[PDB]
C-alpha cells in the first residue's frame, strides 16, 4: 500500500530506490541458479556421468554474486528499517497536538496509543524480516519463468500460465481462511458478550430476583449458539485441508506425467526437482508470512489513522489579535452550528457577550453548554457560523494568539505527575513568584499546602502524596488564574465535599483583579449568583437570555431552575412532612 511510501524518510529516497533494484537482481540471480540445476544434475548421472563440475563453477558464480547483493540489502534494510522506525513515531508525536479534539474518541485514542508505543522493534526489522522476504518470494515463481525461457519456451510460458492460476488458488485459500476467522471472532464475541452482560447486571438481577430466569435464557442461548458452531465446522475445513493437498497434487501430478508421458527424458528427473525448487518457497513462506502480513499491515493502518486522518484544525494564522491586547474582549456567536457526527449539538446560536462581564450558561445537560466553551476556547470549531473575539474570528487566529487568549478550568483537573507548584506554573512558566503566590492563594491552594510537609514542592503524582478531588480542582483553578488570558472559562465540576473548592471558584470569578471576560457552565447558585448575564441553553438553542433579577421576575425556565437549586441545598432526608401526595414538589 501507500502506507510504506508515506513512512519513507527524507534524505533516504535514494537508498530505497537503489534497494528496490538492488534486491530485484537477487531474484534474477536465484532464478538462473535454479535453471542451472537443470543441466548440472542432468549430466551428473543421467547421461554421461560426472562432468568435472563445470556448471558448479558457474553456479558458484551466481550463488556468491547473490551473497554480495544480499549482504547489503539486509544491512541497507537494517538502517532503512531503523530510519523508518525513527521518522514514523516522531511524525505522529508532533502531529497529535494539532488534531481536532473531536477526533479523540475512546477507540481512536486506543489506536493512537498502539501506534506510538507497541510499534518499536516491529518497525525496526520491518523491511528485513517481511518486506524483503515477501517481495522476493512473490516474484521468484515468475523469475524462473523468464530464466527458463532460454531452455524451453513451451516449458517457459507453461510456467507463466501456471503462475497465475496457483496465485489465485492461494488467494482464494487465503480468502477462505480470512473469511473463516471473521465468523470465528464473531461467534466467540457473541459467546462472551452474553457472559459480560450477565456479570455487569448481577446486582440488579439478584436484587430483582431475576438471576435464575436470566441464568437459563443465557445458558440456552449459549447452548443454541454451541450447536450452530458445531454444524459450521463440518462444512468448512473440507476445503482448507484441500489446499495443502492442492500443493502436493501439482508436485506428483507433473512429476507423474513427466515420467510416463515422456519416456524420452530420464534426464528430466531434475525436472521433477526443478519444479520442486520452484515450489519449495511458494506457499511454504506465503502461509508462514500470511500470519504476519496483516499483523504488520494494520499496524501500518492504525499508524495510518494518525497521519492520513490528521483532521488538523484549520487554524489559519492570519491574525494575532494585536488590537487591544490584554483587554477583556467581547464574545460573539453568529449563527454558530455544531454537530458531533450527525446529531445536532448547537442549532444556530446567536449572542454577544459584552466585554468585562461574566456569563453563566445553564441548561439540561444537553452538552451544548460545554460545546459553547470549547468553541470559544478553540478546542473545536463551528460547523457553520462564526465565533468572534472582539470582531475577530477565533479560527483566523495565530496558534500562539489563540492559545494565549483563553484560560480554562475544565471539569477534570488534568494534573500531571510532578510537584504541586509545577502543576500551577503550567499557566505561566515565566511568571514572577509574586503572581504564582497570589494565584495559589486565591484558588485556596495554600490551605492544602499546610497539610503538605514539602509545601508546593510536594510531588502529587503516583510516586508522591495523593490529592483529593477538591484539592486537585483548586490546583487546576490556580493554573488557570496564573495564565494572564483576557478570557476565562469554567466547566464547573466542583466537589460537593469541599467547601474550600466551592469558595475557590467564587473567588476566581469575583476576586480576580485581572480584567477578563468570564463564561462558566455551572450548577450551584453560589457560583452563578454573581453573573451579570445568564444563557439558558435547551436543545441546542438559547431559549432564555437576561439578567438574574429579570429572569427570576419572568417566572420561566431559569426561575424554576433557581428555586430547585435553592431547595436542593436545604434538602434533608425525611423532612417533607408527607406533603408529597398533593403537589409533588
Amino acid at each position: 500500500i501507500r502506507t510504506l511510501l508515506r513512512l519513507v524518510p527524507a534524505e533516504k529516497r535514494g537508498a530505497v530506490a537503489g534497494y528496490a533494484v538492488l534486491t530485484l537482481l537477487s531474484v534474477l540471480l536465484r532464478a538462473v541458479g535454479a535453471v542451472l540445476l537443470i543441466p548440472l544434475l542432468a549430466a551428473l548421472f543421467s547421461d554421461t556421468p560426472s562432468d568435472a563440475w563445470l556448471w558448479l563453477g558457474w553456479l558458484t558464480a551466481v550463488t556468491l554474486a547473490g551473497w554480495v547483493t544480499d549482504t547489503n540489502t539486509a544491512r541497507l534494510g537494517f538502517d532503512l528499517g531503523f530510519a523508518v522506525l525513527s521518522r514514523t513515531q516522531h511524525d505522529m508525536a508532533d502531529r497529535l497536538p494539532n488534531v481536532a479534539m473531536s477526533w479523540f474518541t475512546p477507540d481512536n485514542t486506543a489506536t493512537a496509543r498502539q501506534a506510538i508505543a507497541a510499534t518499536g522493534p516491529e518497525l525496526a526489522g520491518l523491511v528485513v524480516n517481511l518486506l524483503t522476504p515477501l517481495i522476493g518470494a512473490a516474484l521468484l515463481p515468475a523469475a524462473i519463468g523468464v530464466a527458463l525461457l532460454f531452455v524451453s519456451v513451451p516449458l517457459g510460458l507453461a510456467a507463466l500460465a501456471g503462475v497465475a492460476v496457483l496465485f489465485g488458488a492461494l488467494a482464494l485459500s487465503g480468502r477462505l481462511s480470512r473469511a473463516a476467522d471473521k465468523v470465528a471472532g464473531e461467534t466467540n464475541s457473541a459467546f462472551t458478550e452474553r457472559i459480560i452482560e450477565f456479570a455487569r447486571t448481577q446486582q440488579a438481577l439478584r436484587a430483582a430476583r431475576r438471576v435464575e430466569p436470566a441464568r437459563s435464557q443465557v445458558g440456552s442461548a449459549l447452548a443454541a449458539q454451541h450447536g450452530a458452531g458445531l454444524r459450521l465446522l463440518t462444512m468448512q475445513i473440507p476445503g482448507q485441508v484441500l489446499f495443502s493437498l492442492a500443493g502436493q497434487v501439482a508436485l506428483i501430478g507433473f512429476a507423474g506425467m513427466a515420467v510416463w508421458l515422456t519416456v524420452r527424458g530420464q534426464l528430466g528427473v531434475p525436472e521433477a526437482i526443478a519444479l520442486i525448487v520452484v515450489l519449495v518457497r511458494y506457499l511454504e513462506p506465503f502461509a508462514a508470512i500470511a500470519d504476519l502480513a496483516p499483523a504488520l499491515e494494520t499496524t501500518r493502518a492504525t499508524l495510518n489513522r494518525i497521519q492520513a486522518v490528521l483532521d488538523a484544525p484549520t487554524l489559519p494564522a492570519g491574525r494575532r489579535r494585536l488590537d487591544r491586547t490584554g483587554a477583556a474582549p467581547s464574545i460573539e456567536f453568529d449563527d454558530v452550528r455544531f454537530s458531533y457526527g450527525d446529531e445536532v449539538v448547537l442549532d444556530g446560536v446567536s449572542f454577544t457577550l459584552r466585554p468585562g462581564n461574566t456569563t453563566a450558561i445553564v441548561g439540561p445537560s444537553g452538552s451544548g453548554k460545554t460545546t459553547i466553551l470549547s468553541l470559544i476556547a478553540g478546542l473545536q470549531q463551528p460547523a457553520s457560523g462564526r465565533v468572534l473575539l472582539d470582531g475577530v474570528d477565533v479560527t483566523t487566529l495565530d496558534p500562539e494568539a489563540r492559545r494565549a487568549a483563553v484560560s480554562v478550568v475544565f471539569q477534570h483537573p488534568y494534573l500531571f505527575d510532578g510537584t504541586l507548584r509545577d502543576n500551577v506554573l503550567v499557566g505561566d512558566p515565566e511568571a514572577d513568584p509574586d503572581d504564582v503566590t497570589a494565584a495559589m492563594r486565591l484558588a485556596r491552594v495554600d490551605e492544602l499546602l499546610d497539610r503538605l510537609p514539602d509545601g508546593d514542592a510536594t510531588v502529587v503524582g503516583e510516586g508522591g502524596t495523593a490529592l483529593s478531588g477538591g484539592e486537585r480542582q483548586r490546583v487546576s483553578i490556580a493554573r488557570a488564574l496564573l495564565k494572564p488570558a483576557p478570557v476565562l472559562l469554567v466547566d464547573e465540576a466542583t466537589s460537593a465535599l469541599d467547601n474550600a473548592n466551592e469558595a475557590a471558584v467564587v473567588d476566581a470569578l469575583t476576586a480576580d483583579p485581572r480584567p477578563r471576560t468570564r463564561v462558566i457552565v455551572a450548577h450551584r447558585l453560589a457560583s452563578i449568583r454573581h453573573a451579570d448575564r445568564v444563557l439558558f441553553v435547551e436543545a441546542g438553542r438559547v431559549v432564555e437570555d437576561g439578567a438574574i433579577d429579570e429572569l427570576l421576575a419572568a417566572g420561566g425556565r431559569f426561575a424554576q431552575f433557581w428555586a430547585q437549586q435553592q431547595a436542593a441545598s436545604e434538602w434533608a432526608i425525611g423532612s417533607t412532612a408527607r406533603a408529597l401526595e398533593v403537589l409533588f414538589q
Partner: nanobody
Framework: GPSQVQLVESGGGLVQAGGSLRLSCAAS????????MTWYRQAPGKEREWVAA????????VYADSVKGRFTISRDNAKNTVYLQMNSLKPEDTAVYYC??????????????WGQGTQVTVSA
C-alpha cells in the same frame, strides 16, 4: 442618596520624562476593601485602557505590561482611598487617568462607577 457612590481623582499635572507622580482616588458610598479597584487611562481620541487593579482582599495586584515595573497600586482602608505611584513616566503615559469600581454581587447587571479623572501630561 445617602449611600451614593462617588469617586474623585487627584495627583495629576505636568512633569517631564523620567519623573514620578502619585495618584489618589477618594471613594465614597462603599468600602474600597469590598470590591476591586482599577486604574484606567484614556488619551484624547483613543479608547480607554486599564493600567492596574488591586484585589478586594488586598494581596492580588495586576499591571498592564506597558507599566509593570514602573507603576505601583496600593490601598489605604483607613482613608478609603486608592493610590497609584507611577515612576519613570514615559510620554506614552500621557492620558486622563480614572479609578473604577463595579456594582456586582447584587443579582443584577453590573454597573460601572467612574470619576471625573485627573490629567497627567508627561513631556520628553
Amino acid at each position: 442618596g445617602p449611600s451614593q457612590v462617588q469617586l474623585v481623582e487627584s495627583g495629576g499635572g505636568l512633569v517631564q520624562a523620567g519623573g514620578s507622580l502619585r495618584l489618589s482616588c477618594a471613594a465614597s458610598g462603599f468600602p474600597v476593601s469590598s470590591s476591586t479597584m482599577t486604574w484606567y487611562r484614556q488619551a484624547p481620541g483613543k479608547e480607554r485602557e486599564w493600567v492596574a487593579a488591586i484585589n478586594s482582599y488586598g494581596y492580588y495586584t495586576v499591571y498592564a505590561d506597558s507599566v509593570k515595573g514602573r507603576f505601583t497600586i496600593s490601598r489605604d482602608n483607613a482613608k478609603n482611598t486608592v493610590y497609584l505611584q507611577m515612576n519613570s513616566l514615559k510620554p506614552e503615559d500621557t492620558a486622563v487617568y480614572y479609578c473604577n469600581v463595579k456594582d456586582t454581587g447584587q443579582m443584577r447587571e453590573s454597573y460601572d462607577y467612574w470619576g471625573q479623572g485627573t490629567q497627567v501630561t508627561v513631556s520628553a
